Amino acid sequence: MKTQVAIIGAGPSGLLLGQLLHKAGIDNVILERQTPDYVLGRIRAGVLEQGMVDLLREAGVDRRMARDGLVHEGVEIAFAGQRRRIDLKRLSGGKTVTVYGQTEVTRDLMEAREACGATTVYQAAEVRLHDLQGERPYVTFERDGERLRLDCDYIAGCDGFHGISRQSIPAERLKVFERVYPFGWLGLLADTPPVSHELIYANHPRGFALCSQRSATRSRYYVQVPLSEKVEDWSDERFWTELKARLPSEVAEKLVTGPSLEKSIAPLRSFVVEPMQHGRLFLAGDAAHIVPPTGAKGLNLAASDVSTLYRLLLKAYREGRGELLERYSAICLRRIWKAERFSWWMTSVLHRFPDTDAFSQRIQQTELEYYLGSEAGLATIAENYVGLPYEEIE
């Protein structure tokens, strides 16, 4: 079996990369460990940057998004009883973000991939990578018991945090950066109208709360929760009572509650590996880095890694410029570290930490008061929130 670019993983990264490549005439095969239905059952991200919205259009997979996605021009931050709005559009020079669920994007791409007929192998068991430093690397996997080999020129590891690709690079070639936060997010998806037309991030003494949305009739809420909590310990009712307890009263009063469609706990983490490649293997998305969701950068960073890898593969195949591929990590890492810093900052100012002394609490409050009341402070939040510019290469 043979292809040009082998792609491990069919989440947003793998599908987006694959779609881009296919439209340009570069053969690519995707290997996914799960079934399509399993991948489609993941409720995750909901905020997309301008850059990602353009990459979807470029991949020709934007019809449904242009119809159903909500364009937001601001986000609110509530702390100490007051609600402060950040005008993203005015402060960033006219950029906005688009709210459209990750499940939707994945569904749009999977459909687009099916229609064009490109190769996708689900239930690809025991994927293994070989000859990463040769001229002809290959992948082996098991489809219903028999071991099959797939030959390619390059391998794109788009298998997420627990994927096999990052684990395939000799640990001594890698430099790992990581911070684990002492809390997670308990998220809840409901078929009720969102409480606000825009998102509300909330710093409350009991912990962080976030009011988000998926459509005009579907909502998503999160509340900061310690690592000891179990999802079965949180009935729908306990969640609504806690959410209400963390929001300003004029917001809590108009909250339409309802039974959960999905409920889960996601732990917060920061993680970066350098470099992001090894021989003919290139990492993209969660396979290479993790950000706490506070800044909504995860899926967005995945898009920029992919945007970069794709353009570098094009130069390589169409222009015979195979040497530019060495620049992948340098290019990606610049944007990644700034997104990691924004995510970390957002996380530290909106969440309540366990053993904080009096001084740190006052500083946290003052960070908010300064950044939310200063035109220059608001602009730092805004330009980072909408998304810093993609570097163009060459």
Ligand X SMILES: O=C(O)c1ccc(O)cc1O
146-151/138-143 β-pairing? antiparallel
Nearest to 385 by CA among 50, 158, 38: 50
286 is in an annotated binding site: yes
User: Can you point out the beta strands (E) in the chain?
Assistant: 5-8, 28-32, 47-48, 70-72, 74-79, 82-87, 97-99, 120-122, 125-130, 138-143, 146-151, 154-157, 175-190, 200-203, 209-213, 219-225, 260-274, 277-278, 281-283, 289-290
222 is in an annotated binding site: yes
Nearer CB in complex with ligand X: 21/45: 45
310 is in an annotated binding site: no
**Sheet harboring 120-122: ordered strands across?**
120-122, 28-32, 5-8, 154-157, 281-283, 277-278
Q: Which member of 100, 310, 371, 385 is catalytic?
A: 385
Of residues 245-304, those binding a second copy (CB under 8 A): 270, 272
Query: For Br ion, which residue of 158, 293, 311, 340 counts as binding (CB under 5 A)?
Result: 293
Structure-token pair, residue 374: 């200063």
64 is in an annotated binding site: no
Distance in angstroms (rounded) separating the CA atoms of residues 242 and 250 = 16
Of residues 313-342, those binding a second copy (CB under 8 A): 337-338, 340-342
Structure-token pair, residue 347: 């996380």
Q: Minimum CB separation from Br ion for residue 350, in Å?
A: 14
42 is in an annotated binding site: yes
CA distances (Å), 288 to each of 8, 29, 178, 360, in order? 13, 20, 12, 32
Q: Minimum CB separation from ligand X for residue 47, in Å?
A: 5
Q: Minimum CB separation from ligand FAD for residue 290, in Å?
A: 7
Distance in angstroms (rounded) separating the CA atoms of residues 210 and 224 = 9
Distance in angstroms (rounded) separating the CA atoms of residues 155 and 138 = 8
Answer yes or no: are the C-beta atoms of 201 and 78 closer than 8 Å.
yes
Residue 369 contact among Br ion, a second copy, ligand X, none, beta carbon within 5 to 8 Å by kind: a second copy
Residue 362 contact among a second copy, Br ion, ligand FAD, none, beta carbon within 5 to 8 Å by kind: a second copy
Nearer CB in complex with ligand X: 27/383: 383
Residue 294 contact among Br ion, ligand X, ligand FAD, none, beta carbon within 5 to 8 Å by kind: ligand X
Distance in angstroms (rounded) separating the CA atoms of residues 268 and 347 = 9
Query: For a second copy, which residue of 215, 344, 353, 372 counts as binding (CB under 8 A)?
Result: 344
Catalytic status, residue 205? no
Catalytic status, residue 278? no
The residues binding ligand X (CB under 6 A) are 45-47, 199, 212, 220, 293-294, 296
Cα end-to-end distance, the chain, whole Å: 34
293 is in an annotated binding site: yes
233 is in an annotated binding site: no
Q: Minimum CB separation from ligand X for residue 266, in Å?
A: 8
Beta bridge partners of 210: 201, 222
30 is in an annotated binding site: no
For CA atoms 380, 383, 384, 386, the dihedral sign is positive
Q: Which member of 201, 310, 317, 328 is catalytic?
A: 201
The residues binding ligand FAD (CB under 6 A) are 8-14, 31-34, 39, 44-45, 102, 124, 127, 158-164, 187, 266, 285-286, 293, 296, 298-299, 302
CA atoms within 13 A on the CB side of 114: 8
154-157/281-283 β-pairing? parallel
Residue 298 in contact with Br ion, rule: CB under 5 A: yes
Nearer CB in complex with ligand FAD: 188/255: 188
Q: Residues at the annotated binding site?
A: 13, 32, 42-47, 102, 201, 212-214, 222, 286, 293, 299-300
Binding site for a second copy (CB under 8 A): 175-179, 270, 272, 337-338, 340-342, 344, 357-360, 362-363, 366-367, 369-370, 374, 376-377, 379-380, 382-383
Binding site for Br ion (CB under 5 A): 43, 101-103, 293, 297-298
Q: Cite the active site residues.
A: 72, 201, 293, 297, 385
